[PDB]
Amino acid sequence: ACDYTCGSNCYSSSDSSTAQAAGYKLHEDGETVGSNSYPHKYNNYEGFDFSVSSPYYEWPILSSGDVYSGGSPGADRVVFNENNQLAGVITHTGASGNNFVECT
Numbered sequence: 001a002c003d004y005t006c007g008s009n010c011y012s013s014s015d016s017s018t019a020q021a022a023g024y025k026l027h028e029d030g031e032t033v034g035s036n037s038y039p040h041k042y043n044n045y046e047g048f049d050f051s052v053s054s055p056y057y058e059w060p061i062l063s064s065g066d067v068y069s070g071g072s073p074g075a076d077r078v079v080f081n082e083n084n085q086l087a088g089v090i091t092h093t094g095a096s097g098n099n100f101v102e103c104t
């Protein structure tokens, strides 16, 4: 079973933890990768009720199991805060335009 299901993509806790560690490290170092400059501030326009406090940052989580290092980011993201706490896993899949919906 999946811990997080983003559309058709299946993720376990280990998948999200691994992606998060990568995103947080780049955040600390003040470095970004890809044309969209990840990791970057996630404003939460959607108004998701995250249990942890802002500010939030989004970083891609890939269905291939590999850590994002540039190129196409896909539709899935892990959202973490300044304390390196996981807020949630979101996706553009099943959401209109560039909006997000939570991965169930």
Ligand SMILES: Nc1nc2c(ncn2[C@@H]2O[C@H](CO)[C@@H](O)[C@H]2OP(=O)(O)O)c(=O)[nH]1
Pocket (backbone or CB within 6 Å): 036, 041, 042, 043, 044, 045, 046, 058, 098, 099, 100
């Ligand atoms: N839907 C959405 N996009 C966000 C949010 N925060 C930042 N963005 C960025 O705002 C722009 C319009 O959605 C995009 O460039 C998007 O970045 P990503 O596309 O990298 O997620 C947010 O809370 N919701």
Ligand SMILES: [Ca+2]
Pocket (backbone or CB within 6 Å): 010, 011, 012, 015, 065
């Ligand atoms: Ca996996």
